[PDB]
Amino acid sequence: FPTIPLSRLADNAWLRADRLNQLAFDTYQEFEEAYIPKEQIHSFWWNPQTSLCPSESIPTPSNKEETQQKSNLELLRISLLLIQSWLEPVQFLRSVFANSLVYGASDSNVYDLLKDLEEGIQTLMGRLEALLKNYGLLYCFNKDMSKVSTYLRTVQCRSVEGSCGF
Amino acid sequence: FPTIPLSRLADNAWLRADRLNQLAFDTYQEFEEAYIPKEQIHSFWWNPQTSLCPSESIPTPSNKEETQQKSNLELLRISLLLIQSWLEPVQFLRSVFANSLVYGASDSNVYDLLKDLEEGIQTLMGRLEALLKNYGLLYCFNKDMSKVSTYLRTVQCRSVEGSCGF
């Protein structure tokens, strides 16, 4: 019989996603500020290179109220597919993180951090059943780690701590 | 000549403190919920065992407005003394973290995390120049890591990102 309570599993799964989202956000801002000229920042803002996004194909909830309509198993399933589409892609971001001065980026094996989160999500389901290319992929990485972090904070808030927030 | 900008050093110093504060808070709640009977939670709330706190002696700002009056070098000096008073004490919390199910507690060498933050703070200054005993110490650890995190988010907000918040 499983010996870790469901609420701890949802908490731990959200903490891992939040860490990956901080790492994705801060290395995305340091990169943009160090290397992308202002000219190119506004351009990409108005036309994102979502072709670079590995996850383009996975249908996700568009607003917080479409997110609230989704069941916990549905939100877990969507989070798993978004982590699974990054498992091979993230190797390309290795040089970004190796060059980053953001605490913990350079000595993080980000492939492992994602494999750990994918196993975290599967375990929860079982209980309930150069520059501009690096920049576009860091944008998509940040966009996706932001969603996963939101889908796991919702499941966490609806699960054994039935009042968590953000 | 120093090659990491002051704002990155203040950011990194705040990220390390925030991580230690999350770790201190979550292992304090898991411990309290797993092991301290409700009876003893209210009692300690109304009479904290601050004798257990290594930092009792260090004078800190009492409210956010006494914090705002302090200079950055003063707030750095106070944060350093609070990290330095934990360097020998934290070894006693080893079994707590080894038993914790909170992500990252059990394989963290928390002594090292504090030595890294102490060196972070010294570098910034140079630019500007069983159960109830474990519970009391985890309370003090959380109280102090909360302050350090606040003093470093203030310095960070006043330093090269002269508009950061929390």
The B-side interface with A (CB below 8 A) comprises 4, 8, 11-12, 15-16, 22, 30, 101-104
CB A138 within 8 A of CB A41: no
Cβ <8 Å between B101 and A12: yes
Helices (H), chain B: 6-35, 38-46, 64-68, 72-84, 94-99, 110-128, 131-158
The A-side interface with B (CB below 8 A) comprises 4, 8, 11-12, 15-16, 22, 30, 101-104
Q: Is A63 exposed, middle or buried (0-12, 13-18, 19+ CB in 10 A)?
A: exposed
Contacts of B30 in chain A (CB under 8 A): 8
Count interface pairs A-B at CB distance under 8 A: 28
Which residues are CB-contacts of A153 (< 8 A; sequence separation ≥ 6)? A14, A18, A164, A166
- Cβ-based neighbour number of residue B33 at 10 Å: 10
User: Is the Cα dihedral B50, B56, B62, B64 positive or negative?
Assistant: negative
Which residues are CB-contacts of B21 (< 8 A; sequence separation ≥ 6)? B142, B145, B146, B148, B149
CB nearest A15 (choices: B4, B12, B103): B103
In chain A, DSSP finds a helix count (H) and a strand count (E) of: 7, 0
CA dist B133 and A64 (Å) reads 44
Cβ <8 Å between B103 and A4: no
Q: Tokens 């120049």 identify what position?
A: B129
CB A93 within 8 A of CB A28: no
Q: Is A56 exposed, middle or buried (0-12, 13-18, 19+ CB in 10 A)?
A: exposed
DSSP A161: S
* H or E element in which residue A27 lies: helix A6-35
Contacts of B102 in chain A (CB under 8 A): 8, 11-12, 15
Pick from A144, A105, A133: which is nearest to A27 by CA?
A105
Which chain A residue shows the shortest CA-CA distance from B16? A103
Q: Tokens 């492992």 identify what position?
A: A112
Pick from A135, A131, A106: which is nearest to A23 by CA?
A106
CB nearest B103 (choices: A12, A101, A104): A12
- Quote the distance between the C-alpha of residue B147 and its chain's center: 6
Chain discontinuities in chain A, listed by preceding residue (C to N exceeding 2.5 Å): 129
Which residues are CB-contacts of A72 (< 8 A; sequence separation ≥ 6)? A128, A154, A155, A158, A159
CA dist A65 and A30 (Å) reads 32
Q: What is chain B's alpha carbon radius of gyration, rounded to the nearest angstrom? A: 16
CA dist A81 and B126 (Å) reads 48
The alpha carbon torsion through B89, B92, B95, B100 (nearest 10 deg) reads -30
Chain discontinuities in chain B, listed by preceding residue (C to N exceeding 2.5 Å): 129
- Collapsed DSSP state (helix, strand, coil) of residue A36: coil
Domain at A1-166, CATH from 1.20.1250.10, 3.40.50.360, 3.10.580.10, 3.30.70.100: 1.20.1250.10
| Exposure string over A112-147, b if 16+ CB within 10 A, otherwise e | ebbeebbebbeebeeeeeeeeebbbbbbbbbbbbeb
Q: Tokens 């309370």 identify what position?
A: B139
CB B32 within 8 A of CB B135: yes
Contacts of B104 in chain A (CB under 8 A): 15
- Cβ-based neighbour number of residue B94 at 10 Å: 13
CB B145 within 8 A of CB B125: no
Q: Give B77→chain A minimum CA distance, Å.
A: 22
| Exposure string over A85-111, b if 16+ CB within 10 A, otherwise e | bbeebbeebeebbeebbbbbbeebebb
CB B156 within 8 A of CB B11: yes
Indicate the resolution in Å.
2.0
